[PDB]
mmCIF file of all heavy atoms in Angstrom:
data_model
loop_
_atom_site.group_PDB
_atom_site.id
_atom_site.type_symbol
_atom_site.label_atom_id
_atom_site.label_comp_id
_atom_site.label_asym_id
_atom_site.label_seq_id
_atom_site.Cartn_x
_atom_site.Cartn_y
_atom_site.Cartn_z
ATOM 1 N N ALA C 1 27.025 62.886 -10.646
ATOM 2 C CA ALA C 1 26.514 64.190 -10.359
ATOM 3 C C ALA C 1 26.881 64.559 -8.895
ATOM 4 O O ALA C 1 27.287 65.614 -8.591
ATOM 5 C CB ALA C 1 25.020 64.285 -10.585
ATOM 6 N N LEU C 2 26.759 63.539 -7.936
ATOM 7 C CA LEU C 2 27.058 63.700 -6.576
ATOM 8 C C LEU C 2 28.580 64.046 -6.354
ATOM 9 O O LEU C 2 28.911 64.972 -5.612
ATOM 10 C CB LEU C 2 26.679 62.538 -5.743
ATOM 11 C CG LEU C 2 25.119 62.323 -5.673
ATOM 12 C CD1 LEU C 2 24.768 61.049 -4.939
ATOM 13 C CD2 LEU C 2 24.491 63.518 -4.963
ATOM 14 N N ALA C 3 29.426 63.324 -7.011
ATOM 15 C CA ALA C 3 30.888 63.598 -6.922
ATOM 16 C C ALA C 3 31.268 65.021 -7.398
ATOM 17 O O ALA C 3 32.017 65.712 -6.759
ATOM 18 C CB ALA C 3 31.707 62.525 -7.689
ATOM 19 N N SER C 4 30.613 65.396 -8.542
ATOM 20 C CA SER C 4 30.868 66.767 -9.038
ATOM 21 C C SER C 4 30.299 67.883 -8.137
ATOM 22 O O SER C 4 30.945 68.867 -8.007
ATOM 23 C CB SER C 4 30.268 66.974 -10.463
ATOM 24 O OG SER C 4 30.958 66.172 -11.410
ATOM 25 N N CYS C 5 29.142 67.561 -7.482
ATOM 26 C CA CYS C 5 28.592 68.500 -6.496
ATOM 27 C C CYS C 5 29.577 68.630 -5.324
ATOM 28 O O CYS C 5 29.913 69.768 -4.836
ATOM 29 C CB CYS C 5 27.230 68.120 -5.990
ATOM 30 S SG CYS C 5 26.372 69.416 -5.134
ATOM 31 N N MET C 6 30.114 67.537 -4.818
ATOM 32 C CA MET C 6 31.167 67.549 -3.791
ATOM 33 C C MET C 6 32.293 68.387 -4.260
ATOM 34 O O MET C 6 32.867 69.276 -3.538
ATOM 35 C CB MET C 6 31.640 66.176 -3.458
ATOM 36 C CG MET C 6 30.629 65.380 -2.646
ATOM 37 S SD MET C 6 31.215 63.677 -2.148
ATOM 38 C CE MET C 6 32.734 64.038 -1.223
ATOM 39 N N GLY C 7 32.727 68.165 -5.563
ATOM 40 C CA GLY C 7 33.773 69.069 -6.255
ATOM 41 C C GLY C 7 33.448 70.543 -6.214
ATOM 42 O O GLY C 7 34.344 71.320 -5.844
ATOM 43 N N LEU C 8 32.216 70.897 -6.503
ATOM 44 C CA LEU C 8 31.778 72.343 -6.476
ATOM 45 C C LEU C 8 32.084 72.919 -5.099
ATOM 46 O O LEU C 8 32.658 74.056 -4.981
ATOM 47 C CB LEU C 8 30.321 72.491 -6.721
ATOM 48 C CG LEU C 8 29.709 72.298 -8.095
ATOM 49 C CD1 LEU C 8 28.254 72.501 -8.084
ATOM 50 C CD2 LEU C 8 30.374 73.321 -9.124
ATOM 51 N N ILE C 9 31.729 72.244 -4.057
ATOM 52 C CA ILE C 9 31.910 72.611 -2.675
ATOM 53 C C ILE C 9 33.377 72.695 -2.308
ATOM 54 O O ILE C 9 33.838 73.648 -1.731
ATOM 55 C CB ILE C 9 31.033 71.795 -1.753
ATOM 56 C CG1 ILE C 9 29.590 72.053 -2.055
ATOM 57 C CG2 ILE C 9 31.270 72.162 -0.265
ATOM 58 C CD1 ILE C 9 28.638 71.001 -1.584
ATOM 59 N N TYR C 10 34.121 71.636 -2.566
ATOM 60 C CA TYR C 10 35.482 71.536 -2.212
ATOM 61 C C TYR C 10 36.319 72.655 -2.883
ATOM 62 O O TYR C 10 37.276 73.178 -2.328
ATOM 63 C CB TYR C 10 36.102 70.193 -2.634
ATOM 64 C CG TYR C 10 37.540 69.872 -2.188
ATOM 65 C CD1 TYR C 10 37.789 69.563 -0.837
ATOM 66 C CD2 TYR C 10 38.623 69.942 -3.056
ATOM 67 C CE1 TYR C 10 39.088 69.345 -0.396
ATOM 68 C CE2 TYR C 10 39.876 69.751 -2.611
ATOM 69 C CZ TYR C 10 40.132 69.467 -1.233
ATOM 70 O OH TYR C 10 41.424 69.206 -0.855
ATOM 71 N N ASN C 11 35.901 73.048 -4.121
ATOM 72 C CA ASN C 11 36.600 74.055 -4.909
ATOM 73 C C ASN C 11 36.171 75.515 -4.503
ATOM 74 O O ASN C 11 36.664 76.395 -5.166
ATOM 75 C CB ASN C 11 36.424 73.809 -6.407
ATOM 76 C CG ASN C 11 37.164 72.584 -6.880
ATOM 77 O OD1 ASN C 11 38.182 72.242 -6.364
ATOM 78 N ND2 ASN C 11 36.619 71.914 -7.926
ATOM 79 N N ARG C 12 35.301 75.628 -3.557
ATOM 80 C CA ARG C 12 34.796 76.951 -3.042
ATOM 81 C C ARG C 12 33.872 77.634 -4.077
ATOM 82 O O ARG C 12 33.656 78.861 -3.963
ATOM 83 C CB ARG C 12 35.959 77.885 -2.690
ATOM 84 C CG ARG C 12 37.097 77.174 -1.920
ATOM 85 C CD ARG C 12 38.199 78.148 -1.644
ATOM 86 N NE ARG C 12 39.485 77.590 -1.281
ATOM 87 C CZ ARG C 12 39.865 77.280 -0.065
ATOM 88 N NH1 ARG C 12 39.140 77.467 1.018
ATOM 89 N NH2 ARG C 12 41.187 76.845 0.073
ATOM 90 N N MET C 13 33.342 76.891 -4.995
ATOM 91 C CA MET C 13 32.443 77.487 -5.945
ATOM 92 C C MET C 13 31.062 77.751 -5.343
ATOM 93 O O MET C 13 30.480 78.722 -5.721
ATOM 94 C CB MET C 13 32.284 76.651 -7.231
ATOM 95 C CG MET C 13 33.637 76.291 -7.861
ATOM 96 S SD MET C 13 33.353 75.877 -9.595
ATOM 97 C CE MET C 13 32.285 77.158 -10.180
ATOM 98 N N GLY C 14 30.676 76.896 -4.458
ATOM 99 C CA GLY C 14 29.372 77.017 -3.799
ATOM 100 C C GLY C 14 29.619 76.713 -2.334
ATOM 101 O O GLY C 14 30.637 76.162 -1.912
ATOM 102 N N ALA C 15 28.728 77.224 -1.457
ATOM 103 C CA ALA C 15 28.824 76.950 -0.039
ATOM 104 C C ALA C 15 27.573 76.395 0.565
ATOM 105 O O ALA C 15 26.475 76.742 0.231
ATOM 106 C CB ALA C 15 29.255 78.248 0.690
ATOM 107 N N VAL C 16 27.764 75.440 1.524
ATOM 108 C CA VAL C 16 26.674 74.796 2.171
ATOM 109 C C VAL C 16 27.144 74.659 3.644
ATOM 110 O O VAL C 16 28.299 74.758 3.953
ATOM 111 C CB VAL C 16 26.260 73.381 1.638
ATOM 112 C CG1 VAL C 16 25.876 73.497 0.198
ATOM 113 C CG2 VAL C 16 27.405 72.376 1.857
ATOM 114 N N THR C 17 26.211 74.375 4.541
ATOM 115 C CA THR C 17 26.547 74.137 5.956
ATOM 116 C C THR C 17 27.211 72.800 6.108
ATOM 117 O O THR C 17 27.084 71.888 5.259
ATOM 118 C CB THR C 17 25.308 74.173 6.922
ATOM 119 O OG1 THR C 17 24.463 73.063 6.553
ATOM 120 C CG2 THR C 17 24.535 75.442 6.742
ATOM 121 N N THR C 18 27.954 72.626 7.212
ATOM 122 C CA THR C 18 28.658 71.336 7.441
ATOM 123 C C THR C 18 27.732 70.107 7.439
ATOM 124 O O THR C 18 28.114 69.050 6.911
ATOM 125 C CB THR C 18 29.463 71.459 8.785
ATOM 126 O OG1 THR C 18 30.329 72.587 8.607
ATOM 127 C CG2 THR C 18 30.242 70.248 8.979
ATOM 128 N N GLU C 19 26.628 70.250 8.116
ATOM 129 C CA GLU C 19 25.685 69.094 8.188
ATOM 130 C C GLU C 19 25.206 68.687 6.825
ATOM 131 O O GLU C 19 25.024 67.535 6.487
ATOM 132 C CB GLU C 19 24.565 69.349 9.121
ATOM 133 C CG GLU C 19 24.336 70.859 9.357
ATOM 134 C CD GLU C 19 25.380 71.511 10.257
ATOM 135 O OE1 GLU C 19 25.562 70.931 11.407
ATOM 136 O OE2 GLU C 19 25.950 72.490 9.896
ATOM 137 N N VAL C 20 24.990 69.713 5.967
ATOM 138 C CA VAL C 20 24.490 69.472 4.574
ATOM 139 C C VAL C 20 25.608 68.772 3.783
ATOM 140 O O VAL C 20 25.364 67.888 3.022
ATOM 141 C CB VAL C 20 23.974 70.737 3.961
ATOM 142 C CG1 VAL C 20 23.757 70.638 2.479
ATOM 143 C CG2 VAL C 20 22.650 71.169 4.656
ATOM 144 N N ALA C 21 26.804 69.286 3.918
ATOM 145 C CA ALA C 21 28.008 68.631 3.267
ATOM 146 C C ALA C 21 28.147 67.132 3.656
ATOM 147 O O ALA C 21 28.342 66.300 2.789
ATOM 148 C CB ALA C 21 29.286 69.365 3.566
ATOM 149 N N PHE C 22 27.884 66.847 4.929
ATOM 150 C CA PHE C 22 27.935 65.495 5.421
ATOM 151 C C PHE C 22 26.848 64.652 4.786
ATOM 152 O O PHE C 22 26.978 63.493 4.484
ATOM 153 C CB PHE C 22 27.815 65.362 6.861
ATOM 154 C CG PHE C 22 29.037 65.762 7.638
ATOM 155 C CD1 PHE C 22 28.933 66.446 8.861
ATOM 156 C CD2 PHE C 22 30.298 65.405 7.204
ATOM 157 C CE1 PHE C 22 30.085 66.833 9.561
ATOM 158 C CE2 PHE C 22 31.446 65.787 7.911
ATOM 159 C CZ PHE C 22 31.307 66.489 9.139
ATOM 160 N N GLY C 23 25.665 65.240 4.689
ATOM 161 C CA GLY C 23 24.534 64.566 4.061
ATOM 162 C C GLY C 23 24.848 64.148 2.604
ATOM 163 O O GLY C 23 24.525 63.063 2.171
ATOM 164 N N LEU C 24 25.481 65.067 1.887
ATOM 165 C CA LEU C 24 25.844 64.853 0.463
ATOM 166 C C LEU C 24 26.907 63.718 0.365
ATOM 167 O O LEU C 24 26.844 62.859 -0.478
ATOM 168 C CB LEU C 24 26.417 66.170 -0.111
ATOM 169 C CG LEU C 24 27.148 66.087 -1.405
ATOM 170 C CD1 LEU C 24 26.278 65.579 -2.535
ATOM 171 C CD2 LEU C 24 27.685 67.448 -1.807
ATOM 172 N N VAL C 25 27.886 63.782 1.329
ATOM 173 C CA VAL C 25 28.923 62.720 1.373
ATOM 174 C C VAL C 25 28.349 61.270 1.582
ATOM 175 O O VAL C 25 28.674 60.391 0.853
ATOM 176 C CB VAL C 25 29.883 62.968 2.613
ATOM 177 C CG1 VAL C 25 30.734 61.735 2.892
ATOM 178 C CG2 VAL C 25 30.782 64.179 2.340
#
């Protein structure tokens, strides 16, 4: 689920702040 959420963000489907993206990573 985490890898797919990263995918959502990478593909520009959803947007989050940079710090939040790092937290997910």
Side-chain angles (χ1 to χ4, degrees):
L2 292 177
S4 294
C5 192
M6 289 181 58
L8 287 179
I9 295 162
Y10 189 73
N11 292 328
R12 318 176 198 270
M13 307 201 46
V16 301
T17 65
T18 303
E19 22 286 307
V20 167
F22 287 142
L24 168 62
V25 165

